[PDB]
């Protein structure tokens, strides 16, 4: 219990009655009270009274923290300077100091911008290192680097409870919900504690997000300290971007410590175990050469059929299937079949010269130019296929070596990409200065220096892509130039973290929607994705723009932006009407594992009547699954059974059977409604192992 | 304040649940739609 002996103890203002009631209330504070603090309305008058007045602060924060207060609740603790693993400690530490210190860190982290919240914050950090429960105390102490000294404060014993838990939930919520400038603190102090820790591919994912060059030297003196070996060569090469294997091969070409990291981490290693084992552990049958190879001839689906048989790779059979298949083939299909031998051969350095050499310097411009194209396809570590085309390149309008400049300048964009590799670009100054009426000259100009130019140091607005900005706005002709030049512009904008290059090109470039389409291309390729919903509702606003191609690319940005929280990626784009919008979602599925909701959207997107959008479905439909697979194939046989429809059928047989290298070439494939010359640039889309 | 239900044995009661068509499980419909539902039954 009864409150009859103990309720009127608040009624005298005597100090000894307080100084023996408050340790007694501390003893009864293990359950708080008998009840939900029905003393509040009588002891709020005691606010004005002041020996053990910090114990009066403990009573006051106990009762105000017992009912409710967002700023007056932690005030007796920040005036108290907390003084005097339990149930009592679970009360005034694990829940009262957690909610109370949480609203103090939130209300002052949003209010002022002191050190009292740093002392109490490290006091709760220490107190929850006593309680030892992560992943709620952690996500509460994020919003007060502070997190850096928290990680070197807490990371002593629990390696995986902050490694597997905190870095996954907090990296996932840090690309999902937290904005950018704290992810750098995640990456750097994660480099600290993960530098103190083993299992180095967590630091290599820190290389995927940092793109740091000190990390690769530390992880290679440390990953030579940890002697599988070629396997971390393999996902080293698949994990890395285009810059840090050239920076890596120059700092390791200096030191290299065994030279076997020069062997692994440029080329030839990430591919020497695979292709013989690709022959060994797997066995493919001749009845897709014969069945999918007996899908009928019209010299267009023979072209695409030889393209399907070009991606059979139980050997290099289609490299040496006789003659008169390419003799039936036309010019950019002669690029396709002169490059098909390289598309069978993404290995065999020495064999590439002696298989392509029959088709080098031949009687046909597309045999030789597609042959040097295949020389760009086969490898990325030769630099001896540079000069037989690199010496020929100069034509100044419309000669053979401009097509060999297509396949060879693009093939050297495939083969090499430095930190900023520039002699090929000084060769590119008479290429963009050449400006042939063939589109793919400036096409593979922007795409080639853009493949060198991805992963750049937050991009640049240097004179290379600035030169193709001014020489782009030189001529407003053949609007595929106004589409495929901001391709490579935005590729140079890639490597951004914080680029205001969208504002720089938004001051230089913008005009009538060719160059406002350049504006929306930089808007796409400079904004790869974070928690940045402001441009997602801006995306919703300029989604309704009357120009229906900045709709196409600007809304096409979605599969780049929200590729991780992919529950949001299904939208009502099929429920929209601007049919290229159904194209946009039809891009936004992608090449991944392809869930039943994705294939359920391919049920309706499979059934559409235009040959361009009907041509747009089987690419991602069979690309997302690279019977089960052949059931939509025979369903397309039921859809048509023009040559566009037989060509999408061959496209589906083809595709059936954040690394930038798999991010570029489909965005290079986004202007499909055009010539078989552009279908000569269809055979460039290398993104598979 | 739950809907008190008593479904004992009658074709009347089956006609008020469904029409006596196949089963009783439209009582699940009238119980989810009256989700504070207390049902009582006999021997």
């Amino acid at each position: 219990r009864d409150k009859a002996p103990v309720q009127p103890q608040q009624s005298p203002a005597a100090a000894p009655g307080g100084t023996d009631e408050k340790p007694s209330g501390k003893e009864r504070r293990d359950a708080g009270d008998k009840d939900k603090e029905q003393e509040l309305s009588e002891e709020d008058k005691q606010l004005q009274d002041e020996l053990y007045r910090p114990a009066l602060e403990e009573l006051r924060r106990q009762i105000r923290s017992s009912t409710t207060s967002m700023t007056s609740v932690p005030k007796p603790l920040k005036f108290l300077r907390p003084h005097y693993n339990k149930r009592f400690a679970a009360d005034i530490i694990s829940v009262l100091a957690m909610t109370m210190s949480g609203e103090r860190e939130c209300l002052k982290y949003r209010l002022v911008g002191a050190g009292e919240v740093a002392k109490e914050w490290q006091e709760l950090d220490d107190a929850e290192k006593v309680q030892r429960e992560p992943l709620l105390t952690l996500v509460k102490e994020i919003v007060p680097l502070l997190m850096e000294i928290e990680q070197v404060d807490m990371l002593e014993k629990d390696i995986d409870e902050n490694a597997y838990a905190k870095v996954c939930l907090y990296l996932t919520s840090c690309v999902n919900y937290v904005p950018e400038p704290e992810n750098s603190a995640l990456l750097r102090c994660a480099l600290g504690v993960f530098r103190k820790f083993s299992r180095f591919p967590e630091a290599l994912r820190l290389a995927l997000m940092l793109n740091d060059m000190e990390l690769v030297e530390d992880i290679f003196t440390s990953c030579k300290d940890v002697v599988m070996l070629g396997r971390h060569g393999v996902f080293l090469e698949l994990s890395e971007d285009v810059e840090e294997y050239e920076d890596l091969t120059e700092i390791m070409s200096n030191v290299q410590l065994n030279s076997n990291f020069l062997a692994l981490a440029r080329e030839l290693d990430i591919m020497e175990p695979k292709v013989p084992d690709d022959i060994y552990k797997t066995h493919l049958e001749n009845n897709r050469f014969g069945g999918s190879g007996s899908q009928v001839d019209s010299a267009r689906m023979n072209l695409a059929s030889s393209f399907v048989n070009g991606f059979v790779n139980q050997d290099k059979l289609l490299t040496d299937d006789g003659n008169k298949w390419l003799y039936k083939n036309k010019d950019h299909g002669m690029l396709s079949a002169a490059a098909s031998l390289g598309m069978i051969l993404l290995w065999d350095v020495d064999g590439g010269l002696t298989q392509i050499d029959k088709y080098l310097y031949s009687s046909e411009d597309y045999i030789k130019s597609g042959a040097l194209l295949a020389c760009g396809i086969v490898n990325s570590g030769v630099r001896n296929e540079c000069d037989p085309a690199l010496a020929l390149l100069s034509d100044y309008v419309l000669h053979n070596s401009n097509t060999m400049r297509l396949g060879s300048i693009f093939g050297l964009g495939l083969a090499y990409a430095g930190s900023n590799r520039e002699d090929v670009l000084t060769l590119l100054l008479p290429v963009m200065g050449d400006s042939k009426s063939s589109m793919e000259v400036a096409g593979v100009t922007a795409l080639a220096c853009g493949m060198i130019a991805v992963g750049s140091c937050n991009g640049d607005v240097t004179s290379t892509i600035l030169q193709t900005i001014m020489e782009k706005s030189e001529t407003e002709l053949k609007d595929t130039y106004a589409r495929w030049l901001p391709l490579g512009l935005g590729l140079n904008h890639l490597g951004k973290g914080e680029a205001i290059e969208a504002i720089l090109a938004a001051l230089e470039v913008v005009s009538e929607p060719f160059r406002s389409f350049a504006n929306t291309l930089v808007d796409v390729c400079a904004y790869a994705g974070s928690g940045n919903v402001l441009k997602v509702q801006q995306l919703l606003h300029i989604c309704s723009e009357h120009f229906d191609s900045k709709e196409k690319e600007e809304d096409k940005d979605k599969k780049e932006k929200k590729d991780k929280d992919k529950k949001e990626a299904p939208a009502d784009m099929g429920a929209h009407q601007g049919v290229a919008v159904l194209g946009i979602a039809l891009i936004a599925m992608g090449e991944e594992i392809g869930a039943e909701m994705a294939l359920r959207t391919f049920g309706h997107l499979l059934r559409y009547g235009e040959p361009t959008l009907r041509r747009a479905v089987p690419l991602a439909l069979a690309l997302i699954s690279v019977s089960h697979d052949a059931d939509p194939e025979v369903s397309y046989n039921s859809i048509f059974a023009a040559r566009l429809a037989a060509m999408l059928r061959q496209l589906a047989q083809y595709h059936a059977k954040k690394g930038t290298l798999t991010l570029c070439p489909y965005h290079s494939d986004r202007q499909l409604m055009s010539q078989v010359a552009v279908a000569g640039l269809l055979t460039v889309l290398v993104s598979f192992l | 304040d739950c809907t008190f239900i008593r479904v004992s044995g009658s074709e009347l009661v089956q006609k008020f649940i469904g029409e006596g068509a196949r089963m009783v499980r439209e009582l699940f419909v009238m119980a989810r739609e009256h989700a504070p539902s207390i049902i009582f039954m006999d021997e």
Binding site: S627, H628 | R22, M23, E26
Partner: protein
Amino acid sequence: LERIKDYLLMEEEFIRNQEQKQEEERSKVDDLRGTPMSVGTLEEIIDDNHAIVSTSVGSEHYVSILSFVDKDLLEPGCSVLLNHKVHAVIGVLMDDTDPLVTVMKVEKAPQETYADIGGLDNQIQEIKESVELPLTHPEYYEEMGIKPPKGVILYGPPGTGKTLLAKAVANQTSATFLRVVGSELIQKYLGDGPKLVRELFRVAEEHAPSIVFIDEIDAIGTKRYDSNSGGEREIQRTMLELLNQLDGFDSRGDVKVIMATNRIETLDPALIRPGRIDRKIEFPLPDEKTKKRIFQIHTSRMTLADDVTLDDLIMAKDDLSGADIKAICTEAGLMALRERRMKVTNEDFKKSKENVLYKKQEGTPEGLYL
């Protein structure tokens, strides 16, 4: 608290779900349509652009289709749209979604996937290569050209997790799922069970590849009722319609027949024979080790201190189930909230242990022949 986010996303999904001329020839077809579009029923189809229909009372007419919707959508026994003037067939009507579909066709992948197991991963492998591999990756059947297994029998003690496995395969699904309780096949009429079989597997056949699961199928052979006209000479005929249905004719199709019993001995060996059901699957009470896994699953999302060993709940009782362990968890929670605590201590598992094991853990009336 996140109730603002939950109720905000709920009201946002509700209003967004509630967010649901130029074409002249379409308006001309709308003028071909009457404003009172009446509804008819097909009997036969005559190829000369007009067929025979049936009225609500049965006035029957030789009327034509508005030929922009397809007449291949029309089948004998489909509801159509009729005019009042010449009573012409206006167009295809969406079909009547019966209580057979709205009750039996479970649209929901119900509960947890294969992390809800204990003592499994052989039977998961058998349901995987017997059902999921004919479903998800039937390309090995192209590699060799060999038939899949047809039927699955689940059997064992009650509370084993036949329900758990049925809702796990009902979770990992891409086929239209159906569930039937085997006690539902006997009614107060003559000739009802076979009609339920015919329309049942007809509905299982018409839509898509489907997964038909029927549980407690032994409750038709060992149960008798006064609420039954005829008797064993109607039950036997229902078993005969299930017999010819399960081993019928004319390309049965991608309908996975999955059935569950408790006892196995009182069943028809003409239904145990392969050809109907090729995967008869033993369900034992697995092991005392994955007990701790079922304790880990059933205590994985509740506040609980250490206070116990699971070996104390291993060297306690010989049979083992999610029904046992789950009742230890729930009854321990009843003791914990009975003692108004969180972080459940040992004595709740002690009185929960004795309460559950006495609860059924007994026998007959003591002595007997111990």
